[PDB]
């Protein structure tokens, strides 16, 4: 075992030296010249009410008008963000739900939590009711994230340190992604739906290949858990948020760490991150009741989105029109 | 809402809100409890006395026309610091300890200490259950000692306020005072501990009722600055 450990150490060394050699100049030196964005003012335009307990997740639709939200009282609600109307109200079998997703075609929704099961709900039925169509079981830990690829393939993240790719038609895993040490907290798909990144409590992020089902790269630099991960609009970068009140920006081709967004007035960890349509603004939610908006190229604080409790989820519309946030006081606010 | 279809949509939304009101009224009149324990503790038999890799279990019981919901965690990993944040709003926590082993007691103490000082678990009062008293009673008179594990047992005597052999009572109150020593070290008067001496009973539900009653009363008194 000692020899194996020695080999691992030499292999690790043969990677840090290469990345340090390729490190070269940093983002700050090159991005200093560009005029700053200035200041950003955003005002609340809607307030969606009706959730009893606190909110953990929400997800926009592709039509840029509908959205779905999940709450601890055992309820899924689909809203109409323009007229503030309610379209559907779905009761769940279990009340400890942690995530929700909305299909790209708008035909299905999914949810899961402290029951090790991911459920699929069919919205367009001959009868005028929403009924469950498939229960996906096989995980050991709690479900922390789930995302659709199309109407038949879904990618789930669990607390048993593994990710999985499913087949909703048959309900059996077709691929398993092992390699993480701690429980996995979030995942983010790619625009071409060929790769996806992941974050876990072992303070590392990995990049996977869906087709062949094996890890390709590993990223480190954080000191504590990973709570949220987003992925650059271009497809060659991504950002993470941790429990040490810091956010990073990692490259794929360079395989290193770019500029870091941190400030001395934040002690609490980040719960969610998301980008803008052009990737110019990175905005993240915190535990100190607030939400901050950063400049993605200069790490300057530009704007504050000031909720009465912890902020748990974010979201940016596909055409970049609006931003939605959830919180533990059971209110959804839409900014613009 | 200038079109007919818009009016029908608004009416549908109003019906949904009425159903949500009904659900809210049902929800506000119920109390949730979280049950914790280990493999040696009889927390699996306490549930049955009150009464497929699932991740959580549920049990419902009623006393004096009040409904209680008690949730027992099922098949999970050994790490707890992540899914413990979903229970920061329960009425109380029921903690079960097996004080008849003399060996894993320090573990139970460490577990209790970690739960008590959690940032998200503040303002939650813990109800302590000391289970399997018959085993301890049978294991104390026969004479496996406590001096080797806890060196301070030699300088401990039964307090005058104890309400009871005398060695059995001294050992019980030593364990109880160790737990209470842990509990009272901090908390700044926002959550409390209610220890008990439980056996392998038809009164645990009543004890939970009374403890929850006292917890809610203290919270309401503190809210109005009457305490």
């Amino acid at each position, epitope marked *: 075992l000692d020899q194996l450990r020695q080999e691992a150490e030499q292999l690790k060394n043969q990677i840090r030296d290469a990345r340090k050699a390729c490190a070269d100049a940093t983002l700050s030196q090159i991005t200093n010249n560009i005029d700053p964005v200035g200041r950003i003012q955003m005002r609340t335009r809607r307030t969606l009410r009706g959730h009893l307990a606190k909110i953990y997740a929400m997800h926009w639709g592709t039509d840029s008008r509908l959205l779905v939200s999940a709450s601890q009282d055992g309820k899924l609600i689909i809203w109409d963000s323009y007229t503030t109307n309610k379209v559907h109200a779905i009761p769940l079998r279990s009340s400890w739900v942690m995530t929700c997703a909305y299909a790209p075609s708008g035909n299905y929704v999914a949810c899961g939590g402290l029951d090790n099961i991911c459920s699929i709900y069919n919205l367009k039925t*001959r009868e005028g009711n929403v009924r469950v169509s498939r229960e996906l079981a096989g995980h050991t830990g709690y479900l922390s994230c789930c995302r659709f690829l199309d109407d038949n393939q879904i990618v789930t993240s669990s607390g048993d340190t593994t990710c999985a790719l499913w087949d909703i038609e048959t309900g059996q895993q077709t691929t398993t992604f092992t390699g993480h040490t701690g429980d996995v907290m979030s995942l983010s798909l790619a625009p071409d739906t060929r790769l996806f990144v992941s974050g876990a409590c072992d303070a590392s992020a990995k990049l996977w290949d869906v087709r062949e089902g094996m890890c390709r790269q590993t990223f480190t630099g954080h000191e504590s858990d990973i709570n949220a991960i987003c992925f650059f609009p271009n497809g060659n970068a991504f950002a993470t948020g941790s429990d040490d009140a810091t956010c990073r920006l990692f490259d794929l081709r360079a395989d290193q760490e770019l500029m870091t967004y941190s400030h001395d007035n934040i002690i609490c960890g980040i719960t969610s991150v998301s980008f803008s349509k052009s990737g110019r603004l990175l905005l993240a939610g915190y535990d100190d009741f607030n939400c901050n908006v950063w400049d993605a190229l200069k790490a300057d604080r530009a704007g504050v989105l000031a909720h009465d409790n912890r902020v748990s989820c974010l979201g940016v519309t596909d055409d970049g029109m609006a931003v939605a946030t959830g919180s533990w006081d059971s209110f959804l606010k839409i900014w613009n | 809402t200038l079109s*007919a279809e818009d009016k029908a949509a608004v009416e549908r939304s109003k019906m949904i809100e009425k159903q949500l009101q009904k659900d809210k009224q049902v929800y506000r009149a119920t109390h949730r409890l979280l049950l914790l324990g280990a493999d040696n503790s009889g927390k699996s038999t306490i549930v049955k006395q009150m009464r497929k890799t699932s991740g959580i279990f549920e049990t419902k019981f009623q006393v004096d026309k009040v409904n209680f919901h008690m949730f027992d965690v099922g098949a999970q990993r050994d790490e707890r610091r992540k899914w413990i944040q979903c229970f920061n709003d329960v009425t109380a926590i029921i903690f079960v300890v097996d004080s008849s082993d003399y060996n894993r007691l320090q573990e139970a103490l460490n577990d209790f200490k970690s739960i008590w000082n959690n940032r998200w678990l503040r303002t939650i009062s813990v109800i302590l259950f000391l289970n399997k008293q018959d085993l301890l009673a049978e294991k104390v008179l026969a004479g496996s000692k406590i001096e080797d594990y806890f060196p301070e047992f030699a300088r401990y005597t039964t307090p005058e306020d104890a309400t009871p052999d005398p060695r059995v009572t001294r050992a019980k109150y030593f364990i109880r005072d160790e737990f209470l020593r842990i509990s009272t070290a901090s908390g700044d008067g926002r959550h409390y501990c209610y220890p008990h001496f439980t056996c392998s009973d038809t009164e645990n539900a009543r004890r939970i009722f009374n403890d929850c009653r006292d917890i809610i009363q203290r919270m309401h008194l503190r809210q109005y600055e009457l305490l």
Partner: single-chain antibody
Amino acid sequence: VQLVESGGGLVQPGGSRKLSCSASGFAFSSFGMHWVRQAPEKGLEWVAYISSGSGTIYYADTVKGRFTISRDDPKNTLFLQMTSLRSEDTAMYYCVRSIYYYGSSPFDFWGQGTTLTVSASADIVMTQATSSVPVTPGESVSISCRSSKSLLHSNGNTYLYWFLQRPGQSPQLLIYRMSNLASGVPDRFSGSGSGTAFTLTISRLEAEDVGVYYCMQHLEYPLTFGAGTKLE
């Protein structure tokens, strides 16, 4: 999803008849309900409307104090109460579902109907250009509809519907809101318009496309149905 109507028969003038529509196979208490009339040799006509929560009720201007609608959700039944029957209400009555939310498709299912023989203004008027056109099984067909008021709304919707009943069956639904295609209809139908003049096109053609095509407008609550365009 299936609806059955019972009652009918021959009623002397001045009498009363009570029609019942029985639904089974879907979540009945979530749909609005309508009654639609069809004269023996004429087009369709709208009669009444009751909503899902029974909070809103409308009637046609022709019959407002004579007819009465009611529903019972426990038993999934819809009723029509008629009193003082005149000699004009001698047609066949249909039972129609409808559900309204963002993206729904109203008027999607129709009943089978029952017959009723009686012995002896400011609303939008909808007109169709022609009455009968002969074609060949494989050629292209275009049908025109015209409206006296702009069916385009401020929000951005254009409320127009096409039904095209088969000669012997109840009407079905082809297009809703001028562009959107129904679920089970073949994807060779299309619709377009400008707000006042409207057209429906059928690229290919088979033996099942024969029948009478109708025009309906949902902009206002009073409903006026298209005259008809038979295909031979």
